[PDB]
C-alpha cells in the first residue's frame, strides 16, 4: 500500500504487532497497524493535504516540537498518518518493525514519542546504520520491543467494555516519529500518527496526508 517518502528518505515498511508462541516451531503474529505489508510499498504525489495548524495541539510544542520542526523544514518531509488499528487479538512479544531507503549513506536516529493530550509520556530512540542495496542504502529496525507503556495502553484499551470508548481514548493518543540524520540533524521524515479502531473486514487500514501551511 501507500508509504511515506521525503527527498532523502523513504519509509517502505512500518508495522506494530503481537507475536504469540504456541510451541517452539509455531508462531502467530497479529498486526495492529501496517504500511507496506499486504501489498508492495509505494510513494506518489496523489495523496491529500492537511493544515498542520489543525493538529499542533495534539503533539509536543516548544523547542524541538512539531511547529519548531515544521518551520525548520524541509516541508516535504512532514506527513500525517491516520491508522485504523486492528485490536481483535487474544509467550507473548509486542514489537515494532520499520524499513527505510535513501540514496545517501547516513547514520540515522529514529525518535518515537508517545503523547497524551499533546504531552510526551515516553520516547524511544534508536540509531540505525546503512547497508548497501542496489545503488542506494537501506535501514532497518527489526522487532524492536514495544515499550511497557504501549503494552499497558493496549491492555487497558481491550478491557474497555465498549468499542466506542476505545475511540474516545484514542482521540487524545498520538505518536510522533522523527527520523533525523544524526550528524547534520536534518529532518529526513517526520510522521504524526493518529488512531481509530478498525471495524473493517479487511482489518487494519491507513490513510496518509501531507502536512502543509495554509
Amino acid at each position: 500500500g501507500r508509504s511515506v517518502a521525503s527527498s532523502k528518505l523513504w519509509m517502505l515498511e512500518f508495522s506494530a504487532f503481537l507475536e504469540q508462541q504456541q510451541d517452539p516451531d509455531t508462531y502467530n503474529k497479529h498486526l495492529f497497524v501496517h504500511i507496506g505489508q499486504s501489498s508492495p510499498s509505494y510513494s506518489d504525489p496523489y495523496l491529500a493535504a492537511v493544515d498542520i495548524r489543525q493538529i499542533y495541539d495534539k503533539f509536543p510544542e516548544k523547542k524541538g516540537g512539531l511547529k519548531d520542526l515544521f518551520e525548520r523544514g524541509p516541508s516535504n518531509a512532514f506527513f500525517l498518518v491516520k491508522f485504523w488499528a486492528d485490536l481483535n487479538t487474544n509467550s507473548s512479544f509486542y514489537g515494532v518493525s520499520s524499513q527505510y531507503e535513501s540514496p545517501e549513506n547516513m547514520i540515522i536516529t529514529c525518535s518515537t514519542k508517545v503523547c497524551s493530550f499533546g504531552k510526551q509520556v515516553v520516547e524511544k530512540v534508536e540509531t540505525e546504520y546503512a547497508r548497501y542495496e542496489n545503488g542506494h542504502y537501506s535501514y532497518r529496525i527489526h522487532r524492536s520491543p514495544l515499550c511497557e507503556y504501549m503494552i499497558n495502553f493496549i491492555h487497558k484499551l481491550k478491557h474497555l467494555p465498549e468499542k466506542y470508548m476505545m475511540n474516545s481514548v484514542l482521540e487524545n493518543f498520538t505518536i510522533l516519529q522523527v527520523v533525523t540524520n544524526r550528524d547534520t540533524q536534518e529532518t529526513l521524515l517526520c510522521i504524526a500518527y493518529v488512531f481509530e479502531v478498525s471495524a473493517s473486514e479487511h482489518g487494519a487500514q491507513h490513510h496518509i496526508f501531507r502536512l502543509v501551511k495554509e
Binding site: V50, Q54, F117, V121, V169, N172, F173
Partner: protein, 40 residues
C-alpha cells in the same frame, strides 16, 4: 493532577462523572478532509 496519567485517561471514558482530563475539540469537528474519517 497529571495530563499523562494513564488511569485518569481511561477513567474519563469508563466513569464520565469522575472524569478529570483536559477538554479537547473532537477530530470530527475540525477542518479535516472527509477521507480522514472514512477508511479506504
Amino acid at each position: 493532577d497529571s495530563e499523562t496519567d494513564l488511569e485518569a485517561l481511561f477513567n474519563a471514558v469508563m466513569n464520565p462523572k469522575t472524569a478529570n482530563v483536559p477538554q479537547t475539540v473532537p477530530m470530527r469537528l475540525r477542518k479535516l478532509p472527509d477521507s480522514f474519517f472514512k477508511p479506504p
